[PDB]
Write a protein that binds this ligand. Structure first.
Ligand SMILES: O=C(NNc1ccccc1F)c1ccno1
Ligand SMILES: O=C(NNc1ccccc1F)c1ccno1
Ligand SMILES: O=C(NNc1ccccc1F)c1ccno1
Ligand SMILES: O=C(NNc1ccccc1F)c1ccno1
Ligand SMILES: [Zn+2]
Ligand SMILES: [Zn+2]
Ligand SMILES: [Zn+2]
Ligand SMILES: [Zn+2]
Lengths: 360, 360
């Protein structure tokens, strides 16, 4: 049984469990069960399962060096898969809700869930709430007596909140902070003074790094009963660094990666997002260039979007990405070395995570 | 210190804790902290705090008959207040999201949160997610070492999921079940065959009774270390009965209670909700009356809404409400008697809950 295959098998299992429980304990009818089945498949499946599979890969590393009965090996792999699916479902939650929040059209080359004709926003908001509720239902059922349940729930909790706070930082990233006020409609920044590397780092640390890198790595440690193999401050530092780099790539692709390849039309420019491109541009531009960015950013007009893309093309941002990238490579390698003192095995799993991020 | 005063004092405390943590652990800036402060006050305050205060009232009943050091008494009351606020915040979550889902205009005589000029739907969806995340942050902080934490989290979890499932049942209550299909836009029922007392009971049991009555009563038991004072099947049965009755009242008020008194313009008729009125009407109407309901239900046109209200006025639904009410009174009194075998104290708290529901 290949690791991916085992992971996929567990989704089927978890899905059956969740739908069967709805029938036996929540009085659900078959048509609503089918609806939620489709909802779960449409929102949870179709990606690469990087986050889930990181939990499984960390657990598999420890299994290769730790002595266990066969049935214990299976139970740990099972737990890693269930934990992996908790992460995927927590992502599915955030994607459904964020697509609604942003008025997104496509995700992964298909319509966003809320756009399905028999869904609508009125249902999709609640479908997203269900998705995250499922994470907990999975955890309490599969992990009821596990010694790691407390620690797993507490971490999951913190990560979820970090992610929501990060969404708050992302959706407000084009406003001026001193003007935020629920009573007053928010103008887009005129000065772009909050488009800095530090502010960008804050948005990305909370919105993605905690759920994409920190939670899968630490969940793999927890299901393996291995959190003492590591210095946790190091695991945090390495997650935050790899995660930021992953977002920088995503920001580049939003602007430069053909829509068919991207699975959507990127709209970061129209949306005035605080992207690595905009930050990096503003960090090297002259006065005329800053002024021209300011005249054209955060507008749906295609001519204005195409002015911004041209400023980006001309400012030679490729050079800055290479330097950014070379620095993350230094730093990631450093942290991997430090991780090796206490756990070669875990260090190597971090190496794989990094390689999968760096080459894609 | 009156119980309400103590409850309110704890909101201030919890609020300060949450905002301070955002500053020391989540890198928040003051303007965003102010935004979330206002958000928390606007979405969490202004109601009667029935649900929160039930936790405090149950705990106070047990305190009057149980021996404890003074500092233990304070700690239990504190815990009950924190637990009460977890419920209020979980409600705040559902109200913010449901107002967005339904396109609601007003709540408690003020605009729904998403309608605030500096909020918008893009922020309010995420603000609602934060609200529920706060419930967990409160629980892990205040209850970290409590022997009841596991049981409290597991219950909270189940209730939250029940509530979401109940929202799914509510928002789909005007569709025909055999036509639910994410691919196909959903027509409103033509036959109203799913407007039955049993189907109505299912919607209400999950959408409101679990979070409004079951969770406050059981949380009061948990913070008191008293879950062995009770037969839990009885607590469930009494919660589900009082809760259904509370919703029947709310359904009546949606239609008949002046908007200034209601805090909003009820739109259950326009929305084709499966309300007690519609069910009860259909359960006694003749063929001509059914046909006239069918021609006029679930339409925004005020003349059609006023036809439905007149059918309701003429069908003498007051008589049916009195009979419904007299039956709940029999049944609630019965359950209260049964609760007295194991706990007079808890029975009496249930009596107060019922009296507060029945007279309002
Ligand atoms: O292919 C899938 N399910 N089929 C399947 C998976 C595992 C084990 C046995 C199977 F029949 C799949 C992809 C995503 N989720 O499930
Ligand atoms: O990447 C560069 N700048 N922009 C940036 C840095 C850190 C985080 C976010 C950022 F946008 C760079 C390479 C060489 N000089 O600047
Ligand atoms: O009046 C409120 N806060 N003032 C307050 C409350 C308790 C203790 C001392 C106080 F100064 C209130 C209502 C809703 N939330 O807080
Ligand atoms: O209340 C009555 N019917 N309607 C109903 C009953 C239980 C739950 C939901 C309902 F709408 C009633 C009183 C006397 N005859 O019918
Ligand atoms: Zn977004
Ligand atoms: Zn992006
Ligand atoms: Zn609603
Ligand atoms: Zn209502």
């Amino acid at each position: 049984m290949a690791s991916m295959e085992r992971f996929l098998s567990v989704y089927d299992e978890v899905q059956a469990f969740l739908l069967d429980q709805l029938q036996s304990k929540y009085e659900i009818d078959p048509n609503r069960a089918r609806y939620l089945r489709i909802m779960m498949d449409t929102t949870c499946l179709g990606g690469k399962y990087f986050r889930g599979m990181t939990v499984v890969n960390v657990a598999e590393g420890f299994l290769a060096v730790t002595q266990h009965d066969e049935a214990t090996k299976e139970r740990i792999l099972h737990d890693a898969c269930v934990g992996g699916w908790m992460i995927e479902f927590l992502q599915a939650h955030y994607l459904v809700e964020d697509d609604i929040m942003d008025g997104s059209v496509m995700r992964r080359g298909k319509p966003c869930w809320y756009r399905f004709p028999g869904v609508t926003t009125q249902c999709a908001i609640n479908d997203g709430i269900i998705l995250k509720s499922w994470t907990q239902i999975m955890a309490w059922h599969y992990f009821a007596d596990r010694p790691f349940l407390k620690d797993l729930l507490c971490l999951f909790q913190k990560v979820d909140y970090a992610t929501a706070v990060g969404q708050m930082y992302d959706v407000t990233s084009m406003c001026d902070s001193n003007k935020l006020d629920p009573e007053v409609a928010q103008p887009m920044t005129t000065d772009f003074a909050e488009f800095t590397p530090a502010i960008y780092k804050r948005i990305v640390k909370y919105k993605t790094t905690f759920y994409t890198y920190l939670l899968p790595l630490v969940m793999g440690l927890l299901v393996s009963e291995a959190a003492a193999s590591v210095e946790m401050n190091l695991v945090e530092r390495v997650a935050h660094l790899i995660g930021e780099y992953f977002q920088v790539q995503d920001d580049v692709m939003d602007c430069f990666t053909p829509p068919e390849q991207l699975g959507k039309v990127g709209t970061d420019i129209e949306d005035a997002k605080c992207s690595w491109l905009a930050v990096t541009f503003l960090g090297k531009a002259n006065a005329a260039q800053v002024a021209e960015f300011k005249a054209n950013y955060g507008e749906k007009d295609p001519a204005k979007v195409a002015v911004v893309k041209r400023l980006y093309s001309k400012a030679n941002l490729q050079a800055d990405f290479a330097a950014y990238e070379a620095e993350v490579v230094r730093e990631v390698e450093s942290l991997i070395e430090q991780l090796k003192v206490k756990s070669p095995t875990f260090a190597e799993s971090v190496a794989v995570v990094w390689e999968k991020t760096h080459k894609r």
